[PDB]
Amino acid sequence: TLNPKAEVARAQAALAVNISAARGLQDVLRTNLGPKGTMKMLVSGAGDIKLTKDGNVLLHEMQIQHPTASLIAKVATAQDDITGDGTTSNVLIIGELLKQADLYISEGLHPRIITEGFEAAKEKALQFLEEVKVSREMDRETLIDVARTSLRTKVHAELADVLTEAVVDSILAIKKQDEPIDLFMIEIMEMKHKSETDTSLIRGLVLDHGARHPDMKKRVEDAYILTCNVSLEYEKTEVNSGFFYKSAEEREKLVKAERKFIEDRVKKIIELKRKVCGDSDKGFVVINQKGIDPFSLDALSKEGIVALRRAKRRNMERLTLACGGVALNSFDDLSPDCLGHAGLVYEYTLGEEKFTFIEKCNNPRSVTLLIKGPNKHTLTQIKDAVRDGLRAVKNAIDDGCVVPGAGAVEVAMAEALIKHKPSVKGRAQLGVQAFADALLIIPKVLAQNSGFDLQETLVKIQAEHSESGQLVGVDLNTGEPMVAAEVGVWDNYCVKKQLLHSCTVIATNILLVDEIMRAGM
Amino acid sequence: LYISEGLHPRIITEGFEAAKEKALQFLEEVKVSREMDRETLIDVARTSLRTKVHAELADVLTEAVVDSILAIKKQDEPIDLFMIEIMEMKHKSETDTSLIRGLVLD
Amino acid sequence: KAPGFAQMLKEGAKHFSGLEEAVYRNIQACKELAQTTRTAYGPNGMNKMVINHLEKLFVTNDAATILRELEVQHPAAKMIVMASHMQEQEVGDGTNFVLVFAGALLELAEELLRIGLSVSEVIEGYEIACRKAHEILPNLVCCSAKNLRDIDEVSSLLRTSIMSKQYGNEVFLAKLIAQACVSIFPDSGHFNVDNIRVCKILGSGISSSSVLHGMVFKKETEGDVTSVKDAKIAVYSCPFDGMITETKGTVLIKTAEELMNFSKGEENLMDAQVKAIADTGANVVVTGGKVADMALHYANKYNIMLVRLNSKWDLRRLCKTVGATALPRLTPPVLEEMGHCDSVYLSEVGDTQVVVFKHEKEDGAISTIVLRGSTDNLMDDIERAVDDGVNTFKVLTRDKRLVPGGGATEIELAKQITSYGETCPGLEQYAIKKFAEAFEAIPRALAENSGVKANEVISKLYAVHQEGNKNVGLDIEAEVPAVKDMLEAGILDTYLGKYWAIKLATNAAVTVLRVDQIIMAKP
Amino acid sequence: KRESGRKVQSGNINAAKTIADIIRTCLGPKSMMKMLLDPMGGIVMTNDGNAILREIQVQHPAAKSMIEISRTQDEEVGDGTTSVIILAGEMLSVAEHFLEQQMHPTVVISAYRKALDDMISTLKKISIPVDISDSDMMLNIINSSITTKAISRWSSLACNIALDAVKMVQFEENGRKEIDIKKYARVEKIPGGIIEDSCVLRGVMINKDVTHPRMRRYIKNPRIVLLDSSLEYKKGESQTDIEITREEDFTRILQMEEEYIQQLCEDIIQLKPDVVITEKGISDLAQHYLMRANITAIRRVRKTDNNRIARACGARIVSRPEELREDDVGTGAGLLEIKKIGDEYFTFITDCKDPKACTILLRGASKEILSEVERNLQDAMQVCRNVLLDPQLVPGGGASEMAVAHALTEKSKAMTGVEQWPYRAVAQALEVIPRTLIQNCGASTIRLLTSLRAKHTQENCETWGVNGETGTLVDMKELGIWEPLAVKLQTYKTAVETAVLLLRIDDIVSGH
Numbered sequence A: 001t002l003n004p005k006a007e008v009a010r011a012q013a014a015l016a017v018n019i020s021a022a023r024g025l026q027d028v029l030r031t032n033l034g035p036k037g038t039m040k041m042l043v044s045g046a047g048d049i050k051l052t053k054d055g056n057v058l059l060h061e062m063q064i065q066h067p068t069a070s071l072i073a074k075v076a077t078a079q080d081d082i083t084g085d086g087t088t089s090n091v092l093i094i095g096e097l098l099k100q101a102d103l104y105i106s107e108g109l110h111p112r113i114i115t116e117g118f119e120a121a122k123e124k125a126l127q128f129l130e131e132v133k134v135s136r137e138m139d140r141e142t143l144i145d146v147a148r149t150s151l152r153t154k155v156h157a158e159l160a161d162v163l164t165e166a167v168v169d170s171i172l173a174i175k176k177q178d179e180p181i182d183l184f185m186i187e188i189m190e191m192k193h194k195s196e197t198d199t200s201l202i203r204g205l206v207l208d209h210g211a212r213h214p215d216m217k218k219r220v221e222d223a224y225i226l227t228c229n230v231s232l233e234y235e236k237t238e239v240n241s242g243f244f245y246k247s248a249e250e251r252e253k254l255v256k257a258e259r260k261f262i263e264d265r266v267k268k269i270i271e272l273k274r275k276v277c278g279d280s281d282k283g284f285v286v287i288n289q290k291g292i293d294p295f296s297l298d299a300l301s302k303e304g305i306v307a308l309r310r311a312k313r314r315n316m317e318r319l320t321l322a323c324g325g326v327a328l329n330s331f332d333d334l335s336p337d338c339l340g341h342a343g344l345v346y347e348y349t350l351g352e353e354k355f356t357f358i359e360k361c362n363n364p365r366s367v368t369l370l371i372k373g374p375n376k377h378t379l380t381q382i383k384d385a386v387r388d389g390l391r392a393v394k395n396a397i398d399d400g401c402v403v404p405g406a407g408a409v410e411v412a413m414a415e416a417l418i419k420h421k422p423s424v425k426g427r428a429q430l431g432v433q434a435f436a437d438a439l440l441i442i443p444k445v446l447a448q449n450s451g452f453d454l455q456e457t458l459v460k461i462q463a464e465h466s467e468s469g470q471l472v473g474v475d476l477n478t479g480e481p482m483v484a485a486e487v488g489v490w491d492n493y494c495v496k497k498q499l500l501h502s503c504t505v506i507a508t509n510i511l512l513v514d515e516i517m518r519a520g521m
Numbered sequence B: 001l002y003i004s005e006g007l008h009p010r011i012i013t014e015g016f017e018a019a020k021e022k023a024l025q026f027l028e029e030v031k032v033s034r035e036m037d038r039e040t041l042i043d044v045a046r047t048s049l050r051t052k053v054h055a056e057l058a059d060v061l062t063e064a065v066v067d068s069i070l071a072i073k074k075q076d077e078p079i080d081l082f083m084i085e086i087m088e089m090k091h092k093s094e095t096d097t098s099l100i101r102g103l104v105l106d
Numbered sequence C: 001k002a003p004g005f006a007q008m009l010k011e012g013a014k015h016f017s018g019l020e021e022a023v024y025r026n027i028q029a030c031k032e033l034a035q036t037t038r039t040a041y042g043p044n045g046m047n048k049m050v051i052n053h054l055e056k057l058f059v060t061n062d063a064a065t066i067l068r069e070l071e072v073q074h075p076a077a078k079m080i081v082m083a084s085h086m087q088e089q090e091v092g093d094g095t096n097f098v099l100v101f102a103g104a105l106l107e108l109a110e111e112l113l114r115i116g117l118s119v120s121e122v123i124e125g126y127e128i129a130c131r132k133a134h135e136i137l138p139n140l141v142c143c144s145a146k147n148l149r150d151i152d153e154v155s156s157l158l159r160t161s162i163m164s165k166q167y168g169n170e171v172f173l174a175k176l177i178a179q180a181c182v183s184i185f186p187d188s189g190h191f192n193v194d195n196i197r198v199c200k201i202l203g204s205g206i207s208s209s210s211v212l213h214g215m216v217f218k219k220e221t222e223g224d225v226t227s228v229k230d231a232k233i234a235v236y237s238c239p240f241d242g243m244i245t246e247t248k249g250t251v252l253i254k255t256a257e258e259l260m261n262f263s264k265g266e267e268n269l270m271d272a273q274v275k276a277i278a279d280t281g282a283n284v285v286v287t288g289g290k291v292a293d294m295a296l297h298y299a300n301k302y303n304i305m306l307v308r309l310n311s312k313w314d315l316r317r318l319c320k321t322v323g324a325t326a327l328p329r330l331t332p333p334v335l336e337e338m339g340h341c342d343s344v345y346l347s348e349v350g351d352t353q354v355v356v357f358k359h360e361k362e363d364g365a366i367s368t369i370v371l372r373g374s375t376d377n378l379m380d381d382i383e384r385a386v387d388d389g390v391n392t393f394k395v396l397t398r399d400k401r402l403v404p405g406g407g408a409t410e411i412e413l414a415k416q417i418t419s420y421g422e423t424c425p426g427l428e429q430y431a432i433k434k435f436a437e438a439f440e441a442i443p444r445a446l447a448e449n450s451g452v453k454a455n456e457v458i459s460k461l462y463a464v465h466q467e468g469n470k471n472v473g474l475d476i477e478a479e480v481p482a483v484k485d486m487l488e489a490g491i492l493d494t495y496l497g498k499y500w501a502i503k504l505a506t507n508a509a510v511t512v513l514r515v516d517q518i519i520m521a522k523p
Numbered sequence D: 001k002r003e004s005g006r007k008v009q010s011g012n013i014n015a016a017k018t019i020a021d022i023i024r025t026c027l028g029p030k031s032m033m034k035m036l037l038d039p040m041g042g043i044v045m046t047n048d049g050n051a052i053l054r055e056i057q058v059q060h061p062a063a064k065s066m067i068e069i070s071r072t073q074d075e076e077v078g079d080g081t082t083s084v085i086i087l088a089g090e091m092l093s094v095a096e097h098f099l100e101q102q103m104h105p106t107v108v109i110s111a112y113r114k115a116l117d118d119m120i121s122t123l124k125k126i127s128i129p130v131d132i133s134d135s136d137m138m139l140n141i142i143n144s145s146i147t148t149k150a151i152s153r154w155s156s157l158a159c160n161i162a163l164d165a166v167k168m169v170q171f172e173e174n175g176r177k178e179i180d181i182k183k184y185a186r187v188e189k190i191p192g193g194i195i196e197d198s199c200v201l202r203g204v205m206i207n208k209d210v211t212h213p214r215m216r217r218y219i220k221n222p223r224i225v226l227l228d229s230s231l232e233y234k235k236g237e238s239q240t241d242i243e244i245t246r247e248e249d250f251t252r253i254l255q256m257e258e259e260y261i262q263q264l265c266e267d268i269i270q271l272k273p274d275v276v277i278t279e280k281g282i283s284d285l286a287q288h289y290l291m292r293a294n295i296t297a298i299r300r301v302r303k304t305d306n307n308r309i310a311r312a313c314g315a316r317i318v319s320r321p322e323e324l325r326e327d328d329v330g331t332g333a334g335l336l337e338i339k340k341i342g343d344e345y346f347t348f349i350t351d352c353k354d355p356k357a358c359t360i361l362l363r364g365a366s367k368e369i370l371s372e373v374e375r376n377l378q379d380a381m382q383v384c385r386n387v388l389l390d391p392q393l394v395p396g397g398g399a400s401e402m403a404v405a406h407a408l409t410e411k412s413k414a415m416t417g418v419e420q421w422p423y424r425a426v427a428q429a430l431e432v433i434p435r436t437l438i439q440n441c442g443a444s445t446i447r448l449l450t451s452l453r454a455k456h457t458q459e460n461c462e463t464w465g466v467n468g469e470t471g472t473l474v475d476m477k478e479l480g481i482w483e484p485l486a487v488k489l490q491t492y493k494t495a496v497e498t499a500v501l502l503l504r505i506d507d508i509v510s511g512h
Ligand SMILES: Nc1ncnc2c1ncn2[C@@H]1O[C@H](COP(=O)(O)OP(=O)(O)O)[C@@H](O)[C@H]1O
Pocket: A032, A033, A034, A035, A053, A054, A055, A085, A086, A087, A088, A089, A090, A149, A150, A152, A153, A154, A405, A406, A407, A442, A446, A474, A476, A489
């Protein structure tokens, strides 16, 4: 029953093909869950090596051979765009949801009955999450526990204290008075010639191109920032003329007249420099994005100006909002109203290149986090951990509620679902039981990666019962139960919230797949 | 299902021995010590004979099997199945099965 | 068609299952890398018959040279190679240490994973033992450099670095390298191995070599000028010949009259272009290509010292030392692109005229070791031993701390780490105890390469070290498996060499253990 | 090469049956998904019957006929297309009487055509009228599409848009009450706003951009002009381009280009208009007179798009601009606005009149949500079209199928002949519709379908269908699953007419 040059899987074996793919993708990513989990390598083929535990990178950048498994990879992309965390745990729950459903489907149960149980277990699990969440105030002591919990899953337990204080302070500098937050205010720079532990903050901003003249000032403790976008190099004739010459030297003599339009504008720069506090113990800085002539640079260098040229659009953008200097598109309208101001402005010399720093600003509404490492892939690994750490502190601050980690929420919700009689359909509880057992994969995998027994760990945390709020988790170093709220392990409310919404939708849709047809393949 | 998760087999057998001892105690609580009478044994013999016939010889064989034991059951003696001999005969249908108060010879 | 492939789901990347032990495959690749370099350890190291990418035959025993020509493709092995490249920074020795020790950790880690220990428990134990090693290693510091800048002191310490790279010439090279290094240590905080530029000449042998100041170059002065102190220097890679413009400049020669005229035009062009050099006052020029015969007359006409350096890298040294850049056209009279030098002159050493660029007025820190050799292969191997010797004392510009050699530290450090492993309860004792046995792989290789039974040597070292007789290492001898004191024998390593090597070797092995599955990816 | 004999009819059955087995589970609110392996290794998890068959490659011509007939259904009715192919496949799946009994197709076709006249009559018996004046009933009717969609948050909004929009286009005075959603209800998207800002423009919206600022920005009494000719220099009968090399001849050909474009524009501005709308393009010289006249420049407006304008504002179409009489004035128009609403210009000539046409404004927050609201509203307009064309609903949820099947089975008792056997087989084929609704929910098919047929025997046939969500039986009077009559009649005819077609094929021949 099929046309030539095609194929069709009519019976229920098409569903088993999708269950087998999710089971395989589960066993791949389960080894990189948590801090004690292993790392995966990404060989680009060209010769670039890359190590990372971020499940979004192991699904987005890693191409997957199986067709069905590539769908779940696209969801991990969508999961990372909303919360930025939980992509690995999303796949493990999907793999176990479809695993538990196959046990009942083999007994003659329809998939649509199981999916209706997931929708019921989701609402019960979603309501229980509202009770477990802690709506305490976010303080530096709390965000450190969030940043440590997020950063230890991406580093070697050595850059924890290094990147923790930087990731937390970077967020506190860009929020006050309940203002909306934006991570684009933080710039992420990378530099070589230093060990991995040399990461630190930069209150100001880093610029690529530096000054080019021997008489430049290596540091300017105070200056007015002049934003510009005019090419101070040799330009064409600005008036309605041409090249009326008789030899090469006469052509060069007209270039001098063409430089009169630029050379005079250099004097306008020197004029406002001498006017706006050109006295002793003062300075002046120009951040003109376009080029500057070598001879014109000699004029500004002798006046004590630290000039810059050939900047990027991103540098001029942050330089404006940070320093306040308005971009002057023509020196005819030069005026002191367009001038900014800043504190220390210096160029730190590295072994190979140099970069300009504009630190000691009042409230630039923009900062920079300077990462340092010996290798290329190590810098990319730390860049991903910082972005995952910042987004984790962002969610805890925006969504003021946090939830315990170490599988304490999954263990508590699973006990709640089992203590929940049917309310939508009698047979729907089989899916609720499958949803309950699916949530327990998170503490199970944490016991495996830590090297402890999968069954002993889960049974101990399940036996913890009392006449009071009690949420225990997996101790990766001990294996015994552990109150995640006491030791300082906290997850976000949106991460666990989006897991139940993402796991149920995909595990549902994959179960509703009845046939796999080739669309001209 | 659990052995694939890395569980040892010997641990599973200890759970069976604990559930088995609890399972046996549940029978003592739910067992009905009803006195043996005709109606009670009819339901028991019907429950056994219906699982081996076409639901037509059940009502026929039920009253015969019940009365066969009652014929030999008296004085609180241990029931011996050697007291009941089973004889077969052709040339008749299946529903003609009935009891004989005495022996039958070839 | 079912059954499917176990774990193979990502771009057909072979995902070795749990029974296949994917971690073991990466250990085997790093294990195989050590066996290639394990035999190149010590003075009795076996040379390698290397075939360059240009089908050139070179024989050497340097570890870094092997990895450069040996195109390592397994990324698990590349981690140790990247650790060796990091070992080249902050120190110029210990490359085989990172390869032999990291392979020993991975070899012994597989023994632990087979028992059933988790990969994280092995990582945590090695990181703990590495910290104990950094605490035990300063206590092993027996003697240190006296800080006198004496050739006798410096030559005594360089014997260990030069040895294991060029045997037999331990005495001469220790003195030759010392004479070039002591001349810069007075420049406090400015010593650079880059300042000591090695130049090699085909000659009798290593014994005919000498040490000289300034940038020495074997190619004599093409001009007839001996010495000139002109700072104005200009390098022109373009060969001196008849000038041609970048424009059309079509020269049409039809008759013998026009031939001699334009042939004389080339005489006027070279005379006009060489005249421009003297107009700027640059009486020193370096040629990258050939030299025309008429230019030799013009070089002596305006009294310009002309030099011919055909090697490109010889010119790059001048471009980075004095600043004179190599322009593409025929003698561009650009004073901006010129260099600076206080003294320049020709010199005759070893029946060979060599040009010299030194700094008489300025402080100066440049030097050169003019090597002589009959075979360029053996002469190029001596160059690499000089860099390992110069870099040894570039480290001693830092804290001057030495430790014993010949495997003495590796047994003393293993003896002390095994003690902490016995006291430390839990599962960390297995990885800590094996971390101590990883140090035994160093003298085991040092003993195997000497033709000595390895186990007979380790038993003697652990026996005398149990008696408190520290500083006892392996006696290099083909027939004698005995031991001797390395301090009195004068065999000493660097403290930072073992520190940075133990640190990078541990991290190199941990980065491999943390990995458990290699996956391919398409951009 | 070719096919002949009994292999053709049995082959056409397996092809049509195979296409229906694909989308058997794509029926109802609990429809199942399908996995389509792209050639590049990609997957699309759609559950739309039209989209699945559109992407599948078919070799048999019988399958192409089944698919091409389904596409014709979508143009007329955007709903019930999946029921056509399933019924056509089930009506053809009864190959016992076709070949194994050696009956001729004319005997089968005569029975299938006899049942079709009976199926049509029975559906009208179980029908029920609707009070279209009360919009509350149409809300419950149109919710069949809004249900299980993102627009449920503004479900009442979609009804008022689609309900009132089709009522304007419905020109009942012509007797037949024809409706044209494609022409007289042109839909255009507007970035900006949200789903709540979606409304219906009581006019014609042209998406022409603003080329110059010298144009009317806001007007209270527009005056629109209409003409088909282009505002450019009169060329020859052929498309020969004008090639000139002499400078003196340039001023002559240039003056002819300026004067004729000048004189034509002078007559357009004599009426003092506010916007010149032309069917053809407008050159640069012609636009210099429009910006000088301080009037808006509009071009590229189709014939029907211009016909609606003359009904809206009262303009008059003219061949050329020179014959523009005073009648061509858009007096009474509401307003002329070329405001840039959401980074895109939109020409509004709305008024207080209903010129047998309208235009729907799709406001939204993004192109993704706009397209979601767009495709969800078109089906609601078609349901309003099907109800307003024939306000009679029939019980859904498989009730109309089982209700009709009982009529044929009881009517076949008086059918003396061999045609009774295929006549009854068509009745059993209608049972497949609730057979799939029950299979998707997971409930037992035989147990409920057996009891379902018993309810139609004893109780009234107008109710007691099937609940696709719960799976149990329910009355359609208690659950608003009422579907139109015109959709079921056309769904029943197209299934029988399609099955009659493939049964009439006996030789697949090649030749041109
Ligand atoms: N001290 C810590 N103890 C126990 N579990 C932790 C700890 N830190 C993180 N985890 C667990 O690791 C899991 C993965 O964290 P993370 O890497 O942020 O998400 P993902 O693995 O989905 O990218 C979380 O579910 C969390 O419970």
